[PDB]
Amino acid sequence: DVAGLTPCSESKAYNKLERKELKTLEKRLKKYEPGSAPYLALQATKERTQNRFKNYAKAGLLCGNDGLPHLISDPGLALRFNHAGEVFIPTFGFLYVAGYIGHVGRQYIIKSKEDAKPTDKEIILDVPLALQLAFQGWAWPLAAIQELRNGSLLEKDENITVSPR
C-alpha cells in the first residue's frame, strides 16, 4: 500500500483491463470455427493473457488508479515490502552480465595488444581465444577488484595521451 498504490490482486482497474482484453480476444475468437489454426492461435493468446494477468498478481505488484502495475524503486523500501526483485535484483543481474562483457573485452584487448599488428587481431577475431575468455569470465568481479588492488586495472596518467591545455 506504499506510494498510495493498491496491490494488483485487490485492485479494481486491473480487473477492468483484464476483462477488456479477454473481451476483445473473445470477440476476435468468435469469428473463426473452433477446429481452425487461427482459433488455436487466439486461444493460446487468451491463455497467455490470463496467465500473465495471474502471474502479475500474487507477486507483490502494485498499481495506481489505472490497473497498470508500478515498480517500487528505492531499495530498503523494496526490501521491506517484498519488491526487491522488481528493480533491485534485475540491476544486480544486469551489472553481473555487463561486467562479464566488459571484463571479457578488456581481457581480449590486453591479450591481443601483445602480438605484432594488434589491429589485425582486432578486425579478424581469434575465435578460440574469444571463446576461452568467454568461458573464463564467470568470476569477473573478483578478478576486476584484484587488478584494482594490484594496480594493473588503472594506467598512470604519465603514460596516457593528454590533450593540450
Partner: protein
C-alpha cells in the same frame, strides 16, 4: 574598399563584398576585437550600452502600460477578473477583412484587439493599480525614467565624466552597494509600497498620491515597530471569505506568514508578500556591509580567495589567483552572471505556476502557460550564453601562469575525465529512457498495456510527503503530528501550507506518476547532454588533440580545412550552436510536459495524462494531435474563428523552421557557384548590366551559415510552440 560602415574594424572596411555588411552587423558589439581601442574605452562603452539596454527595457514596459491603458479593458477586468479576457493592444491592419475584424472584436471592444497573455493585468491588479489614469501616469513616468537613463548613457560617456578603469574594478564597493542599495533598500521601498497601497487596495481602500500621507497603513501606527511589538502587525489577517476588490471579510494586517493561497483568488497573500520583501530587504542590507570599502572594516575578496585553499593538497593551490582572473576577464563575470540569472529565471518559472503571486492568475490558464514557456526558454538561452561566454573567457583572457595549480588549472587538467563522465551519464540516460519509452510504446501497441515498465517516482513522492502531501501515505515530516517539523510552527504556516498542498486543483506539488518520472528523467538527460556539449566546447576551447592552437584562432572560426581527416565545427562557437539545438529540445520537452500535465489538470482528466504520458504515441496523439484541432481550424474554407492568427503564426513557425533547415543542411560551395553563375548572368545581359553592385555578392560564411540557420531554427521553434500553446489553451478555456 575602406568603407565607412565598419568604423570599428579597418579590416572589415576593406572588404569588397556583401559579407562586410553581415560581419559589420554581427561584430557590432564585440568591442574587444575592435581595432585601436583600450580597456578603459571598452568599459565606458559597456557602461553606455548598459544604460541603453536599461532605457530600452523601461521604454518597453512603459509601452506595455500605455497600450494597456489605451485600447484596453483594465477597468472592466478589474470589475470582473474571471469572465472578460484581458486586452493587449488594438489591431489596425489595412490588409484585414470584414470577417477578420468581426472575429477579432473580443472583450467588449470597439475594434480588433489582441487577448493579453503576458499577465500584466493580474500583476497590476495585485500591486494596486485600478484605473487607466494610473497606468497612463505610470507609462509617462517610465518614459521619463528611460529619458534620464538616456541622459546617463550620454553623460557618463562624455569626456571629463568617463569613469576610470579601476572604478569599474572596485569589486568590493560595487558588491556592497548593489547588495545594500540595488537589492536591499529597493526591496524595502517595494514592501513599503505594498503595505501602503496594495494591501489597502486589496482591502477596498483607495490609496493614491492625492490621499497619501493621510491614510495609516496599520491602526497601531508605527509604535509596534519602535517598541519591538512586531506581532501587532500579524494580528488581524484577512479571512478566507474575503473579496479582493472590496472590504468584505477584511482585516488589519500588513505583515504576516499566512501560508498557502488566498481562497477567493488562488494567489499568495499580499501581507505575506510584503513580509517576504521586508525580510529580504533587511537581510540584503545586513549582507551589504561585508566587503572592504574605503572605511577600516570589511572583507577583501582577494584575501578570502587566497585563504580558502584546502590543506593536504585537496584542491592544489586552491582558489588563489582567482580574484585577478574574475576582475580582468569580463567574460568570466558575464558567464557567472548569465548562469545565475538563468538559474533564477528557471526558479521563477518553476515557482510561479505552483505558487501564483498575482490575483486571478491561476484561473488564467493561457497566461500561466505563456509565462512559464517564456521564462523557461529565456533561461535556457541565457544558460547557453553563460557557457558560451565561459568558453570565450577560456579562449581570450586566461593566463595559466597567473592561476597556476588552482581550481581552474585543475579542471583544465582533468577536463577529459569530466567530459567522459558527462558523456557516460548522457549516454546512459538517453539509452535507457528511449529503451523504456520504446518498450512502453510497443507494449501498448500489442493491446496489453500492463507489460509496460512503470517505475513509481518514490523519491520525489517521499519528498512531497515530507513537505505535507498526505496522498502518497508515509509517516514523514509535515504529515504526522508527532514529527518535530510539524510541531515547530504548527500555528504559523502549516494550517495554510497543508491546505494548499493537499488540494489537487492548484498546481502546488501536483500528483506525479510513472510518466512524470520518465519525463523528468528525460529532462535530466537533456540537461546533462546540453551540459556535456557546452563543457566540451568550453574546456577544449583553447586547445585539443585535433587542434592544439585553438586559442590562436579565436572563438568563432569555421574550420581548419579537410586536412587531418576533417575539422569542421571544431570551435567552441560551433559547440554552442549545437547546444542551442539541444537546449531547444530540452525546453521543448519541459514545456510539453508542463503543457500536457496542466491541460489534463484543467480539464479534470488527470488520469488521461497518467495513463497516456507513459508511451510516446500518447504524447503524439493525446497532446500534439488532440489539442491541435482548434489551432488548425483558426481559418479554413468553412470560415474563421478567433484563432486564425495562431494558425497563421503556427504555419509561419513551421516555415521558418524549414528555412533554418535550408541554411543548415547546405554549407557554402553550391551557393558560391550559384552566385558566380548569377553574377555572369547579370553581367552578360542587356538592359540590366547598366546598374551594377558596389559590393560583390558572395555566399554567406560557414560561421554565418550556422548563425543564420540557428536563428531561423530558434525563431520557428519559438513561434510554432507559442502558437500551439496559446491556441490550445485559449480555444477551450478563458
Amino acid at each position: 574598399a575602406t568603407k565607412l560602415f565598419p568604423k570599428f574594424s579597418q579590416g572589415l572596411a576593406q572588404d569588397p563584398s556583401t559579407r562586410r555588411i553581415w560581419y559589420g552587423l554581427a561584430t557590432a558589439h564585440d568591442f574587444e576585437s575592435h581595432d585601436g581601442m583600450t580597456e578603459e574605452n571598452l568599459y565606458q562603452k559597456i557602461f553606455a550600452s548598459h544604460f541603453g539596454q536599461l532605457a530600452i527595457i523601461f521604454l518597453w514596459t512603459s509601452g506595455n502600460l500605455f497600450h494597456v491603458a489605451w485600447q484596453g479593458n483594465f477597468e472592466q477586468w478589474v470589475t470582473d477578473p474571471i469572465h472578460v479576457r484581458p486586452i493587449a493592444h488594438a489591431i489596425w491592419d489595412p490588409h484585414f477583412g470584414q470577417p477578420a475584424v468581426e472575429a477579432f472584436t473580443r472583450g467588449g471592444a470597439s475594434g480588433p484587439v489582441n487577448i493579453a497573455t503576458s499577465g500584466v493585468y493580474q500583476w497590476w491588479y495585485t500591486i494596486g493599480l485600478r484605473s487607466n489614469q494610473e497606468l497612463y501616469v505610470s507609462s509617462v513616468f517610465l518614459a521619463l525614467v528611460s529619458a534620464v537613463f538616456l541622459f546617463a548613457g550620454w553623460l557618463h560617456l562624455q569626456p571629463n565624466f568617463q569613469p576610470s578603469l579601476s572604478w569599474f574594478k572596485d569589486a568590493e564597493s560595487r558588491l556592497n552597494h548593489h547588495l545594500s542599495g540595488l537589492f536591499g533598500v529597493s526591496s524595502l521601498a517595494w514592501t513599503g509600497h505594498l503595505v501602503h497601497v496594495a494591501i489597502p487596495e486589496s482591502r477596498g481602500q483607495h490609496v493614491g498620491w492625492d490621499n497619501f500621507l493621510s491614510v495609516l497603513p496599520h491602526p497601531q501606527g508605527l509604535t509596534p515597530f519602535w517598541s519591538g511589538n512586531w506581532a501587532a502587525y500579524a494580528q488581524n489577517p484577512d479571512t478566507a471569505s474575503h473579496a479582493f476588490g472590496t472590504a468584505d471579510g477584511s482585516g488589519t494586517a500588513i505583515l504576516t506568514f499566512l501560508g498557502g493561497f488566498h481562497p477567493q483568488t488562488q494567489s499568495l497573500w499580499l501581507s505575506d508578500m510584503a513580509h517576504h520583501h521586508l525580510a529580504i530587504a533587511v537581510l540584503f542590507i545586513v549582507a551589504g556591509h561585508m566587503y572592504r570599502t574605503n572605511f577600516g572594516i570589511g572583507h577583501r575578496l582577494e584575501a578570502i580567495l587566497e585563504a580558502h585553499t584546502p590543506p593536504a593538497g585537496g584542491l592544489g593551490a586552491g582558489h588563489k589567483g582567482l580574484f585577478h582572473t574574475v576582475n580582468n576577464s569580463l567574460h568570466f563575470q558575464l558567464g557567472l552572471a548569465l548562469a545565475s540569472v538563468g538559474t533564477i529565471t528557471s526558479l521563477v518559472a518553476q515557482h510561479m505556476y505552483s505558487l501564483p503571486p498575482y490575483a486571478y492568475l491561476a484561473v488564467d490558464f493561457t497566461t500561466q502557460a505563456s509565462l512559464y514557456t517564456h521564462h523557461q526558454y529565456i533561461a535556457g538561452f541565457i544558460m547557453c550564453g553563460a557557457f558560451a561566454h565561459g568558453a570565450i573567457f577560456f579562449i581570450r583572457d586566461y593566463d595559466p601562469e597567473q592561476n597556476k595549480g588552482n581550481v581552474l588549472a585543475r579542471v583544465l587538467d582533468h577536463k577529459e575525465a569530466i567530459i567522459s563522465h558527462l558523456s557516460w551519464v548522457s549516454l546512459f540516460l538517453g539509452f535507457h529512457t528511449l529503451g523504456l519509452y520504446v518498450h512502453n510504446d510497443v507494449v501498448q501497441a500489442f493491446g496489453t498495456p500492463e507489460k509496460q515498465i512503470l517505475i513509481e517516482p518514490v523519491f520525489a513522492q517521499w519528498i512531497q510527503a515530507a513537505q505535507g502531501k498526505s496522498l502518497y501515505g508515509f509517516d514523514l515530516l509535515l504529515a504526522s503530528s508527532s514529527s518535530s517539523a510539524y510541531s515547530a510552527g504548527q500555528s504559523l504556516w502549516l494550517p495554510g501550507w497543508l491546505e494548499a498542498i493537499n488540494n489537487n486543483q492548484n498546481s502546488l506539488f501536483l500528483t506525479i506518476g510513472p510518466g512524470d518520472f520518465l519525463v523528468h528523467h528525460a529532462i535530466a538527460l537533456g540537461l546533462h547532454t546540453t551540459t556535456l556539449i557546452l563543457v566540451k566546447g568550453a574546456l577544449d576551447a583553447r586547445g585539443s588533440k585535433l587542434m592544439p592552437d585553438k586559442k590562436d584562432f579565436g572563438y568563432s572560426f569555421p574550420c581548419d580545412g579537410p586536412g587531418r581527416g576533417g575539422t569542421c565545427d571544431i570551435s567552441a562557437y560551433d559547440a554552442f550552436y549545437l547546444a542551442v539545438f539541444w537546449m531547444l529540445n530540452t525546453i521543448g520537452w519541459v514545456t510539453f510536459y508542463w503543457h500536457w500535465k496542466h491541460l489534463t489538470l484543467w480539464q479534470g482528466n488527470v488520469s488521461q495524462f497518467d495513463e497516456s504520458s507513459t508511451y510516446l504515441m500518447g504524447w503524439l496523439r493525446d497532446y500534439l494531435w488532440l489539442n491541435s484541432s482548434q489551432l488548425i481550424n483558426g481559418y479554413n474554407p468553412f470560415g474563421m474563428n478567433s484563432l486564425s492568427v495562431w494558425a497563421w503564426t503556427f504555419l509561419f513557425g513551421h516555415l521558418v523552421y524549414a528555412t533554418g533547415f535550408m541554411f543548415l543542411i547546405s554549407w557554402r560551395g553550391y551557393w558560391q557557384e550559384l552566385i558566380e553563375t548569377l553574377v555572369w548572368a547579370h553581367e552578360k545581359t542587356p538592359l540590366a548590366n547598366l546598374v551594377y553592385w558596389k559590393d560583390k555578392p558572395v555566399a554567406l560564411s560557414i560561421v554565418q551559415a550556422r548563425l543564420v540557420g540557428l536563428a531561423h531554427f530558434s525563431v520557428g521553434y519559438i513561434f510554432t510552440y507559442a502558437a500551439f500553446l496559446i491556441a490550445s489553451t485559449s480555444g477551450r478555456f478563458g
